[PDB]
């Protein structure tokens, strides 16, 4: 068992139940994270929004530093602790098969660029802001599949796919020797809507004689159809490495698995003046 | 094995059918088999309507599973003359290409259309002989795959080498049959179908002639692409009505006003359409020259006099007619095209506007806004009535008597 | 019983239907539903459809979804949740129902499918998400392209090469493939040959359905999915029609969909107002000023320009096309050419038709080249075949064509438009594909020159046959008037000021006051008189139309104006037929004929010089000033 | 959708043919008869329109539709003649058609000793249909014969309108009370809008005192057929209450309300919408609404007060 991974999951559960922002208009101790879970039950949502500034204000920012440095390693631990808080409050959001909940972080400090993408930042929470050029269609993805064998007839549930159609090598029934025959069960598999967005550099950054670089940004969760072509959006996610399936020397490709898209061009006509006045000092 | 005893009664039934069928005290099937020996043409044209009057059980078993009765027919013909090809001729209803559902699979169907193009000659293995690499064991394998095009799973029991010296091969040619445009509805594109020939059935038709082909509708793995194996290539009240109408001296005035009744006046223009649809006489000189019998009429004038309405009336009146435009038809539309198959890596020909409409009227719209590279192919088809294309090493001449 | 079937004791809905004790009770209730259900008049709606199915030799049984939910809810809730196991059991129910009335039906067809139509919930291609997976969703759109009828595989029977035995039958799925490892007679892993004698094939066709142009929001791109047609559903949807695909939203896994960086299996196709809205059309059209109310309602965001609103309103309804003894096809689409100086809201009229007409494709003259308007023969990057992609004139069948900047066009694109304005067909023969598609639509262009001393043949960069195909020639002249500038400036400011239940009702009341007839009622009024009401030309003044064209052609020769051919005479009947459609009448009276002549006269007199405008207005003032 | 055509001269052999056609197409189509040239001359006495009410003359129901009903002659204190001389001549000519139609449809059922009593008092009255320069109306009598061309439609079970046109033919229509006589073996069919606004109709009427099988003992034909004919104001209280008694116009929308609501979520219950409780709620809704009509006997289904927000 991961000793460091269990400590982050235990601290993440208490952050969503003890943090509360005091309102300036009413003066009542209202919990923003507790009220956000109740709002996801009426609208039937599966994506939460957690601000990074609230994580740094607790325990002297000890929890926000472990997530911003190693985000891919603590990714299954953050999703496991979130399901425990939802089950305690509103357990009706689990039955659809269990629903897949994703965490979308917003309002990030440092906003990196495309030229600053290096190999040392692989597996850390970054923020890349660019212009959207080309977008793909809305297609599902095989997340947690279920393989059923033909000999032992065992339903192997909770089968993760690391960007490849992976199959189980052994059947849980000890009275079987099947290492190839496997059938995919669509009625017991968890599907997620993924979309690849090819972003480019910003229009305001026009340097000297250089080549325009592109980055394949993969969106998951409720981030589908959120980055329209022609609008500069602020992406947020982790830098993943997607290999070449057609070649299966292994060639790799630098990707960016984002989880939240913030449109800069987008942000009641009277509310447009109170936002710009409050965002400044 | 019950199939061994049933196969003996089928072969014996076909042997006695030829030695007993007679018409007007004359043996047609017996005289056709004896005359083919001196000519040395292993073929026999057996009509499908003659098997109905002889035995109803024979015609029923042939139309049900022809993949097993046809190979048994070739063995009975050779026993009488002592491999002969069986040619089946049907004179029943013509089934269109659009009415070929899943109920006609492995059944004798009759088609009628114009051949699009013709591929080259291909060799088909029938009696293969393999030889081992260690003990050098020579064994002969008889390929009885009648419903097959290519080598679908070659039987190889593989240290065996197929001997190309002591092996028999037969001829095989691929064809492309298109449905009749008279039955194709408006707003739709006529489909095609790939056929296969064997033995004397290769190099017999001309890409641009309407013939009747009776074959078996089947499928093969390449979702599967269908195919039809070619087996044989082929009132009194209505005649009296046409003879009495020709005797009327006012026939030249009746057919003139009947063609395109929307356009008023212009008796000299409507009179040329009757002479254009009839045409002259295709005379063939004994020296080797051919005279042009088709009439070409060019229209010109100010727009607004129903120019496009007159061209659409001729297409609906003439049996064989293909409507085309000016800029919408390039070199691959007006003439024949040379396309490459991405599956077999072979260059196959394709019919165009002046190729599929052989023997009819080709209505072209906007002849003044045409290009210069497409004007050379039209001038060659208006004098010699032929299309000579020598591209990609393919020198084929197609008749264009439009 | 029906009470024990509601208590779902399984973990999922697909597991409860597959139970033997549940499937036997479901098929039992479905058998009595097709024999005991009666309509409001005391007649069995499903009893008559069974007898008519065997007489026509069909395998499609239409079952209304609204008639099933009003009786038993157990058979209606499980159909929208798991339509896979529900359609398989109900298919055998319809087969047993036809055997009772016609026992000799098993020799023709072996399986009878069910055509489910009329769905309560309607969804589009953009609202397709992960929650609609494995559910019958009714999606409506326009068919763009389609494939051929390829025989699919269902019951494949393989043959062994080591013994000669037949292995099968095996159900072939459209997602995975059958891979036989061991045999049942020789136990070997040799190659198996597919027998072409004992395999039951089926029809298969892939049709790409796109969203309708009247439902796509402005500023976005339309979406398209893939529709699979099986059994007798093929050869039904044609490229250029509006159908309602009522299939199941499934998904397929592809090997190239994961390394480079949603198929809907149809079940029933139906080609395309209520009873309360039909009675309201006769009450409004009964007034004597119904024609003036429609002209004032056309483009409410533009003040003035009453002569241009009469041409756009007549082009939306169109004429009545009819064949002449199977020889000629007279067109009925009114072609309007918007000409004049830019700045008079010329491009704003084209955007109004795209949001009101049932099928309007907006195009331009700069971006749209040769293939941007007509069809094309492109190569597919997947199947490596020469496909056929539609253009602006191909995807706008029986609709309105909107082309911007008609003067800035190439010579190769002007000839293709003239060829489609007379025969209403675009013949394209490229890459050996000789196809003659149809193109019947009202082309409403808007070019830019306007010198009043010069005629229309010199101001507009066009030819003579191009200008002759247009029925109405609208000419706008930017004049100087202090009275018109005050009324136009007030309407602009009034339209920019006004740009939770009490706030929404106040916004709808301000929009209806500025249009005075609402916009939602005008959209359904045009489509109602275009597919049901067809006015005729019975009892009309044939001598009056001959005298108008005789005086119009005699004045254009002595003055040297635009020559009037025979195409201008047929444009009067097209405008007169459109006026009768606005009044919901089946006959064109003398009032509609006098209004169609004034439109052609005003479009021809104003399209000349200054000296010709002051001369033709005095001689042709008798036909315009009606009694 | 089959429209058979058979001559009536051969029937006076074709008895079981019409008996098997009233179940599918129901509406029969005749053709030639004894009246040919005199049928077109009846329009001379059609442009009258000069009679008041008292169940006679035109009925100005408001607006462009009217029904010129002409009462019979033997009925006392219910006569109002005018200038319809051609209408009275066809009253006796078409009277034989009503008796001959029973010999080819009612004769095959049981016997013929019952159809002679319904067509004996001659109490039927014609109804002339006119339009000035259409709601789904149900037939009043049991038999309805009317010469026309189109007009009729279908409200062949594809819920679609069928506009047929047969020149020189007679279109027959079946009533509503005739279905209950044949334990449900008939189907009604209304009309539709058409440019031809000149059609003559004729509906027969059973006698006032006649039994209606066994289920029509307490309710005769005079009490049942007079309900749909008086809803077009004496009595005025009984005419308004009969129009509001049609509970199907408000109870049919409830059977589909919860069906379209539970489908989007798949109510006080949390476990969706079971079929055992959904069918019980429909029977309880028709039972609760039945007590509202029983305790009120002019209610036009009033609305309830919506829950307003506080402050």
Asked whether residue C8 is domain-assigned, the answer is no
- Cis amide linkage into residue C169, ω under 30° from 0: yes
Q: What is the DSSP letter of A264?
A: T
> Which residues from C are below 8 Å from A181, CB to CB?
181
How many Å apart are CA C66 and CA C117, to the nearest integer?
9
By C-alpha distance, the chain C residue nearest A187 is C14
Residue B15 burial by Cβ neighbours in a 10 Å radius (0-12, 13-18, 19+): middle
Within A80-123, strands assigned E span 102-106
Spatial contact of B96 and B185, defined as CB atoms under 8 Å apart: no
Asked whether residue C12 is domain-assigned, the answer is no
User: What separation in angstroms does the CA of C128 have from each of A224, C543, D304?
Assistant: 12, 60, 38
Spell C48-66 as b/e; 16+ CB within 10 A means b.
bbbebbeeeeebebbbbbe
Torsion sign, CA atoms C577, C578, C584, C589: negative
- Within chain A, how many helices (H) and strands (E) appear? 6, 14
How many Å apart are CA C107 and CA C91, to the nearest integer?
17
Both C478 and C433 in one domain: the answer is yes
Instruction: Look up the CATH number of the domain holding residue C487.
Output: 3.40.50.300
Q: What is the token pair recorded at D182? A: 């044949």
User: What separation in angstroms does the CA of D37 have from each of C508, D32, D33, D40, D148?
Assistant: 61, 11, 11, 6, 15
Both C450 and C471 in one domain: the answer is yes
In this structure, the dihedral spanned by the alpha carbons of residues D294, D296, D297 and D299, taken in order and rounded to 10 degrees, is -120
C219 is in an annotated binding site: no
Spell A2-29 as b/e; 16+ CB within 10 A means b.
eeebeebbebbbebbeebeeeeeeeeee
If we measure between CA atoms, which residue out of B121, B98, B122, B124 comes closest to residue B109?
B98
Spatial contact of D174 and D144, defined as CB atoms under 8 Å apart: yes
> Which residues from A are below 8 Å from C128, CB to CB?
138
Residues 6+ apart with CB under 8 A from D93: D34, D35, D38
How many Å apart are CA B13 and CA B262, to the nearest integer?
64
Spatial contact of C228 and B223, defined as CB atoms under 8 Å apart: no
Task: Kindly give the interhelix angle for C83-101 and C45-56, rounded to the nearest 10 degrees.
Answer: 80
- Provide the domain limits for residue C266: 122-153+201-272
Asked whether residue C14 is domain-assigned, the answer is no
Nearest-neighbour CA in chain C from A229: distance (Å): 10
Spatial contact of C161 and B155, defined as CB atoms under 8 Å apart: yes
How many Å apart are CA C194 and CA B275, to the nearest integer?
56
C196 is in an annotated binding site: no
> Which residues from C are below 8 Å from B302, CB to CB?
565
Give domain A1-91+98-110's CATH superfamily.
Answer: mini-chromosome maintenance (MCM) complex, chain A, domain 1 (3.30.1640.10)
Note whether C223 contacts B: Cβ–Cβ < 8 A: no
End-to-end CA separation in angstroms for chain B: 60
> Which residues from C are below 8 Å from B313, CB to CB?
327-328
Both C145 and C163 in one domain: the answer is no
Q: What is the token pair recorded at B52? A: 């109905």
Experimental method: cryo-EM
Within B180-274, strands assigned E span 192-196, 210-220, 225-233
Spatial contact of A67 and A125, defined as CB atoms under 8 Å apart: yes
Spatial contact of D153 and D163, defined as CB atoms under 8 Å apart: yes
Q: Which of C12, C130, C251 sits opposite A187 (nearest CB)?
A: C12
Spatial contact of A126 and A112, defined as CB atoms under 8 Å apart: yes
Total of domains in chain C: 4
Tokens 């006529």 belong to which residue?
Answer: B190
Both C404 and C311 in one domain: the answer is yes
Q: Do B153 and C191 touch (CB under 8 A)?
A: yes
Looking at the DSSP bridge assignments, the partners of residue C204 are C150, C230
Which string of DSSP letters, residue by residue, matches C576-600?
HHHHHHHTT-SB--HHHHHHHHHHH
Looking at the DSSP bridge assignments, the partners of residue D216 are D212
Kind of pairing between the strands at B361-364 and B321-324: parallel
Both C263 and C323 in one domain: the answer is no
Residue C194, SS3? strand
Nearest-neighbour CA in chain B from C567: distance (Å): 6
How many Å apart are CA C192 and CA C180, to the nearest integer?
8
Count of C-beta atoms within a 10 Å radius of residue C541? 11
How many Å apart are CA A112 and CA A120, to the nearest integer?
13
Best residue in B155, B181, B218, B333 for a mutation probing chain C (most C CBs within 10 Å): B333
Looking at the DSSP bridge assignments, the partners of residue B361 are B321
Asked whether residue C13 is domain-assigned, the answer is no
User: What separation in angstroms does the CA of C19 have from each of A90, A97, C7?
Assistant: 32, 20, 14
Q: What is the token pair recorded at B298? A: 């060019």
Both C316 and C268 in one domain: the answer is no
- Cis amide linkage into residue D246, ω under 30° from 0: no
Both C189 and C337 in one domain: the answer is no
Phi, psi of C231 (to 5 degrees): 60, -130
Binning chain D into helix, strand and coil, the percentages to the nearest 5 are 30, 10, 60
Q: What is the token pair recorded at A82? A: 């979130």
C340 is in an annotated binding site: yes
Asked whether residue C461 is domain-assigned, the answer is yes
Which string of DSSP letters, residue by residue, matches B337-356?
EEEE-TTT--EEEE--HHHH
Q: Which of C326, C328, C384 sits opposite B306 (nearest CB)?
A: C328
Which string of DSSP letters, residue by residue, matches C504-536?
HHHHHHHHHHHH---HHHHHHHHHHHHHT---B
How many Å apart are CA C347 and CA C352, to the nearest integer?
9
Question: What was the resolution (in A) of this experimentally determined structure?
Answer: 6.1
Instruction: Look up the CATH number of the domain holding residue C82.
Output: 3.30.1640.10
Which string of DSSP letters, residue by residue, matches C258-274?
HH---EEE-S-EEE---
Spatial contact of C264 and C230, defined as CB atoms under 8 Å apart: no
Last residue of a domain, one of C243, C272, C301: C272
By C-alpha distance, the chain C residue nearest A225 is C126
Spatial contact of C330 and C622, defined as CB atoms under 8 Å apart: no
Q: Do A140 and C261 touch (CB under 8 A)?
A: no
If we measure between CA atoms, which residue out of C613, C621, C350 comes closest to residue C479?
C613
Where along chain A do its domains lie?
Answer: 1-91+98-110, 111-139+193-244+251-265, 140-192
Both C236 and C336 in one domain: the answer is no
Spatial contact of C193 and C158, defined as CB atoms under 8 Å apart: yes
How many Å apart are CA C452 and CA C432, to the nearest integer?
50
Q: How many CA atoms lie within 13 A of D275 on its CB side?
A: 20
Nearest-neighbour CA in chain C from A7: distance (Å): 34
Q: What is the token pair recorded at C312? A: 């756009």
Torsion sign, CA atoms B5, B6, B9, B12: negative
How many Å apart are CA C15 and CA A220, to the nearest integer?
30
Last residue of a domain, one of C175, C200, C225: C200
Both C227 and C304 in one domain: the answer is no
Question: Which helix (DSSP H) or strand (DSSP E) does residue A12 occupy?
Answer: helix A3-18
Both C143 and C232 in one domain: the answer is yes
Phi, psi of B5 (to 5 degrees): -75, -30
How many Å apart are CA A148 and CA C536, to the nearest integer?
68
How many Å apart are CA A54 and CA B95, to the nearest integer?
77
How many Å apart are CA C218 and CA A153, to the nearest integer?
52
End-to-end CA separation in angstroms for chain A: 46
If we measure between CA atoms, which residue out of C454, C450, C455, C368 comes closest to residue C414?
C368
Asked whether residue C344 is domain-assigned, the answer is yes
Looking at the DSSP bridge assignments, the partners of residue C472 are C336
Asked whether residue C5 is domain-assigned, the answer is no
If we measure between CA atoms, which residue out of A144, A148, A172 comes closest to residue A158?
A144
How many Å apart are CA C165 and CA C186, to the nearest integer?
9
Spatial contact of C315 and C333, defined as CB atoms under 8 Å apart: yes
Phi, psi of C338 (to 5 degrees): -80, 115
Q: Which of C49, C76, C77 sits opposite D157 (nearest CB)?
A: C49
By C-alpha distance, the chain C residue nearest D253 is C70
Spatial contact of C203 and C230, defined as CB atoms under 8 Å apart: yes
C341 is in an annotated binding site: yes
Phi, psi of C330 (to 5 degrees): -75, 130
Binning chain A into helix, strand and coil, the percentages to the nearest 5 are 25, 30, 45
Residue B324, SS3? strand
> Which residues from C are below 8 Å from D277, CB to CB?
6
Cα Rg for chain A, rounded, in angstroms?
21
Phi, psi of B256 (to 5 degrees): -75, -50
Tokens 């046109």 belong to which residue?
Answer: D165
Q: Do C328 and B191 touch (CB under 8 A)?
A: no
If we measure between CA atoms, which residue out of D173, D97, D95 comes closest to residue D137?
D173
Both C96 and C223 in one domain: the answer is no
What are the start-end ranges of the H helices in D119-253?
A: 177-181, 221-224, 236-244, 248-251
Question: Which helix (DSSP H) or strand (DSSP E) does residue C144 occupy?
Answer: strand C136-146
Residue B142 burial by Cβ neighbours in a 10 Å radius (0-12, 13-18, 19+): exposed
Q: Which of C133, C176, C259 sits opposite A191 (nearest CB)?
A: C133
> Which residues from C are below 8 Å from D262, CB to CB?
77
Nearest-neighbour CA in chain D from C119: distance (Å): 10
Kind of pairing between the strands at C269-271 and C263-265: unpaired
Last residue of a domain, one of C182, C200, C218: C200
Asked whether residue C69 is domain-assigned, the answer is yes
Both C500 and C357 in one domain: the answer is yes
Q: Do C432 and B332 touch (CB under 8 A)?
A: yes
How many Å apart are CA C477 and CA C511, to the nearest integer?
30
Looking at the DSSP bridge assignments, the partners of residue C376 are C389
Q: What is the token pair recorded at C460? A: 């507009």
Spatial contact of C107 and D292, defined as CB atoms under 8 Å apart: no
Phi-psi region of C196 (alpha: psi -120 to 50; beta: other; left: phi over 0): alpha
Spatial contact of C335 and C315, defined as CB atoms under 8 Å apart: yes
- Within chain B, how many helices (H) and strands (E) appear? 12, 14
Kind of pairing between the strands at C399-404 and C360-363: parallel
User: What separation in angstroms does the CA of A120 have from each of A67, A218, A239?
Assistant: 16, 20, 10
Looking at the DSSP bridge assignments, the partners of residue B350 are B337
Q: Which CATH architecture has domain A111-139+193-244+251-265?
A: Beta Barrel (2.40)
Q: Do D157 and C45 touch (CB under 8 A)?
A: yes
């Amino acid at each position: 068992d991961d000793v460091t991974g269990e400590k982050v999951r235990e601290a993440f559960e208490q952050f969503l139940e003890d943090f509360s922002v005091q309102s300036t208009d009413t003066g009542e101790v209202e919990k923003v994270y507790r009220a956000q879970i109740e709002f996801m039950k009426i609208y039937d949502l599966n994506t939460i929004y957690i601000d990074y500034q609230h994580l740094s204000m607790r325990e002297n920012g000890a929890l926000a530093m472990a997530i911003s440095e190693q985000y891919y390693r603590f990714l299954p631990f953050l999703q496991k602790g979130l399901r425990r808080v939802v089950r305690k409050y509103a357990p009706e959001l689990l039955n659809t098969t269990e629903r897949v909940f994703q965490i979308s972080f917003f309002n990030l400090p440092t906003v990196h660029r495309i030229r600053d993408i290096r190999s040392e930042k692989i597996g850390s929470l970054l923020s890349i802001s660019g212009t959207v050029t080309r977008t793909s269609e809305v297609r599902p993805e095989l997340y947690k599949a279920s393989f059923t064998c033909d000999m032992c007839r065992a339903i192997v549930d909770n089968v993760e796919q690391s960007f490849k159609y992976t199959e189980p090598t052994f059947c849980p029934n000890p009275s079987c020797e099947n290492r190839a025959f496997w059938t995919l069960n669509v009625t017991r598999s968890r599907f997620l809507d993924w979309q690849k967005v090819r972003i480019q550099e910003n229009a305001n950054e026009i340097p000297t004689g250089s080549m325009p670089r592109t980055l394949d940004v993969i969106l998951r969760g409720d981030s589908v159809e959120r980055a329209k072509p022609g609008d500069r959006c602020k992406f947020t996610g982790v830098e993943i490495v997607v290999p070449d399936v057609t070649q299966l020397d292994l060639t790799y490709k630098i990707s960016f698995l984002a989880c939240h898209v913030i449109s800069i061009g987008s942000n009641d006509n009277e509310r447009d003046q109170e936002v710009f006045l409050n965002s400044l000092s | 094995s019950p199939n061994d005893d049933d196969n003996t009664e089928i072969i014996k039934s076909f042997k006695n059918f030829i030695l007993e069928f007679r018409l007007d005290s004359q043996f047609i099937y017996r005289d056709q088999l004896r005359n083919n020996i001196l000519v040395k043409n292993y073929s026999l044209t057996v009509n499908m309507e003659h098997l109905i009057g002889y035995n109803e059980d024979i015609y029923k078993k042939l139309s049900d599973e022809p993949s097993d009765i046809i190979p048994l027919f070739e063995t009975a013909i050779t026993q009488v003359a002592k491999t002969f090809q069986l040619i089946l001729n049907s004179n029943a209803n013509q089934i269109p290409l659009r009415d070929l559902d899943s109920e006609h699979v492995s059944k004798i169907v009759r088609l009628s259309g114009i051949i699009i193009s013709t591929s080259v000659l291909s060799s088909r293995a029938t009696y293969l002989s393999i030889m081992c690499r260690n003990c050098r064991h020579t064994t002969s394998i008889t390929i009885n795959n009648f419903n097959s095009i290519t080598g679908n799973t070659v039987s190889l029991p593989d240290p065996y080498i197929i001997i190309h010296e002591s092996s028999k091969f037969i001829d095989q040619q691929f064809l492309k049959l298109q449905e009749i445009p008279e039955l194709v509805p408006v707003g739709e594109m006529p489909r095609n179908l790939t056929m296969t020939c064997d033995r004397y059935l290769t190099n017999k038709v001309i890409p641009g002639t309407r013939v009747t082909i009776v074959g078996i509708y089947s499928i093969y793995n390449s979702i599967r692409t269908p195919y039809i194996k070619i087996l044989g290539i082929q009132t009194e009240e209505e005649e009296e009505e046409f003879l009495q109408l020709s005797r009327n001296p006012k026939l030249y005035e009746i057919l003139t006003n009947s063609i395109a009744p929307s356009i008023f006046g212009n008796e000299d223009i409507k009179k040329a359409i009757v002479c254009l649809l009839m045409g002259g006489s295709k005379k063939i000189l004994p020296d080797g020259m051919r005279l042009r019998g088709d009439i070409n009429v060019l229209l010109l004038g100010d727009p607004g006099t129903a120019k496009s309405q007159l061209l659409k009336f001729v297409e609906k009146v003439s049996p064989i007619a293909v409507y085309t435009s000016g800029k919408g038809s390039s070199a691959a539309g007006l003439t024949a095209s040379v396309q490459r198959d991405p599956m077999t890596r072979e260059f196959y020909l394709e019919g165009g506007a002046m190729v599929l409409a052989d023997g009819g009227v080709v209505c072209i719209d906007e002849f003044d806004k045409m290009r210069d590279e497409d004007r050379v192919a039209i001038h060659e088809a208006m004098e010699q009535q032929t299309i000579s294309i020598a591209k990609a090493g393919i020198t084929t001449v197609l008749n264009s008597r439009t | 019983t029906l009470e024990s079937l509601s208590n779902v004791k399984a973990n999922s809905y697909s597991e409860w239907i597959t139970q033997p004790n549940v499937s036997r009770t479901i098929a039992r209730e479905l058998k009595s539903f097709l024999l005991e259900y009666t309509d409001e008049t005391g007649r069995s709606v499903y009893g008559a459809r069974i007898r008519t199915l065997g007489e026509m030799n069909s395998e499609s049984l239409e079952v209304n979804y609204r008639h099933l939910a009003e009786s038993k809810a157990i058979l209606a809730l499980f159909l929208a949740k798991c339509p896979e196991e529900m359609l398989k059991i109900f298919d055998l129910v319809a087969m047993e129902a036809t055997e009772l009335h016609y026992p000799d039906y098993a020799r023709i067809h072996s399986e009878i499918h069910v055509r489910i139509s009329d769905f309560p919930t309607i969804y589009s291609l953009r609202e397709l998400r992960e929650s609609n997976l494995s559910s019958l969703v009714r999606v409506t759109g326009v068919v763009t392209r389609r494939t051929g009828v390829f025989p699919q595989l269902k019951y494949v029977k393989f043959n062994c090469l080591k013994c000669g035995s037949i292995l099968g039958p095996f159900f072939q799925d459209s997602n995975e493939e059958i891979r036989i490892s061991f045999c049942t007679n020789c136990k070997s892993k040799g190659p198996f040959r597919v027998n072409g004698e004992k395999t039951v094939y089926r029809n298969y066709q892939r049709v790409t359905l796109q969203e309708a142009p009247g439902t796509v929001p402005p500023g976005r791109l339309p979406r398209h999915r893939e529709v699979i047609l099986l059994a007798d559903l093929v050869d039904v949807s044609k490229p250029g029609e509006e159908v309602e695909v009522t299939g199941i939203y499934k998904n397929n896994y592809d090997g190239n969909l994961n390394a480079k960086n949603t198929i809907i299996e149809a079940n029933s196709i139906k080609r395309r107002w209520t009873e309360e809205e039909e009675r309201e059309f006769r009450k409004i059209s009964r007034d004597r000023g119904i024609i003036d109310k429609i002209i004032s309602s056309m483009a409410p965001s533009i003040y003035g320009h009453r002569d241009i609103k009469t041409a756009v309103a007549c082009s939306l309804f169109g004429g009545v096309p009819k064949n002449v003894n199977g020889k000629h096809s007279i067109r009925g689409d009114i072609n309007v050419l918007l000409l004049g100086d830019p700045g008079t809201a010329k491009s704003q009229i084209l955007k109004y038709v795209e949001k009101t007409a049932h099928r309007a494709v907006f195009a331009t003259g700069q971006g749209a080249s040769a293939v941007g308007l007509t069809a094309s023969v492109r190569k597919d990057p997947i199947t490596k075949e020469w496909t056929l992609e539609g253009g602006a004139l191909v995807l706008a069948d029986k609709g309105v064509c909107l082309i911007d900047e008609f003067d800035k066009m190439n010579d190769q694109d002007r000839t293709s438009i003239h060829e489609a304005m007379e025969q209403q067909s675009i013949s394209i023969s490229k890459a050996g594909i000789v196809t003659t598609l149809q193109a019947r639509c009202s082309i409403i262009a808007a070019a830019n020159p306007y010198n009043s001393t010069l005629p229309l043949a010199q101001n507009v960069s066009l030819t003579e046959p191009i200008l002759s195909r247009f029925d109405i020639l609208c000419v706008v002249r930017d004049l100087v008037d202090e009275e018109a500038d005050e009324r136009l400036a007030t309407f602009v400011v009034d339209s920019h000021v006004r740009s939770q239940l009490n706030a929404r009702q106040r916004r709808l009341q301000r929009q209806r006051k500025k249009e005075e007839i609402p916009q939602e009622l005008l959209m359904k009024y045009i489509h109602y008189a275009r597919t049901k009401i067809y006015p005729k030309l019975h009892q009309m003044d044939m001598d009056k139309v001959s005298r108008v064209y005789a005086d119009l052609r005699r004045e254009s020769i002595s003055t040297g104006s635009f020559p009037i051919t025979v195409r201008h005479l047929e444009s009067i009947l097209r405008i007169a037929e459109s006026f009768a459609k606005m009044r919901l009448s089946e006959f064109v009276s003398s009032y509609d004929l006098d209004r169609a002549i004034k439109v052609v006269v005003d479009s021809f007199v104003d399209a000349q010089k200054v000296s010709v405008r002051r001369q033709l207005r005095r001689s042709f003032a008798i036909y315009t000033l009606g009694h | 959708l089959r429209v058979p055509v058979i001559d009536l001269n051969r029937v006076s052999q074709l008895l079981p043919v019409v008996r098997a056609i009233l179940l599918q197409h129901d509406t029969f189509l005749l053709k030639n008869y004894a009246n040919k040239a005199v049928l077109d001359a009846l329009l001379a006495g059609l442009t009258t329109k000069d009679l008041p009410d008292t169940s006679q003359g035109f009925d100005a129901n408001f607006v462009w539709l009217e029904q010129y009903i002409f009462d019979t002659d033997p009925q006392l204190r219910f006569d109002r003649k005018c200038r319809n001389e051609s209408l009275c001549s066809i009253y006796s000519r078409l009277f034989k058609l009503g008796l001959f139609f029973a010999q080819l449809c009612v004769k095959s059922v049981v016997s013929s000793a019952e159809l002679q009593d319904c067509i004996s008092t001659s109490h039927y009255a014609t109804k002339l249909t006119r339009y000035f320069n259409y709601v789904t109306f149900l037939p009043t009598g049991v038999l309805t014969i009317f010469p026309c061309a189109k007009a009729i439609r279908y409200k062949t079970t594809d819920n679609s309108w069928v506009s047929i046109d047969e020149p020189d033919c007679l279109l027959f229509h079946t009533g509503t009370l005739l279905a209950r006589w044949s334990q449900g073996m008939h189907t009604t069919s209304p009309l539709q809008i058409d440019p031809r606004a000149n059609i003559v109709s004729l509906t027969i009427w059973p006698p006032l005192t006649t039994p209606i099988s066994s289920k029509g003992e307490g309710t005769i034909a005079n009490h049942l057929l007079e309900q749909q004919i008086k809803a077009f104001y004496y009595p005025r209280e009984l005419s308004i209450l009969r129009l509001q008694d049609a509970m199907k116009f408000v109870k049919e929308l409830f059977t589909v309300c919860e069906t379209v609501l539970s489908l989007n979520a798949l109510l006080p219950k949390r476990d969706n919408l079971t079929t055992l409780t959904n069918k019980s709620r429909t029977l309880a809704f028709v039972e609760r609404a039945e007590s509202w009509y029983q305790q009120v006997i002019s209610s036009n289904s009033k609305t309830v007060l919506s829950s307003k927000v506080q402050t």
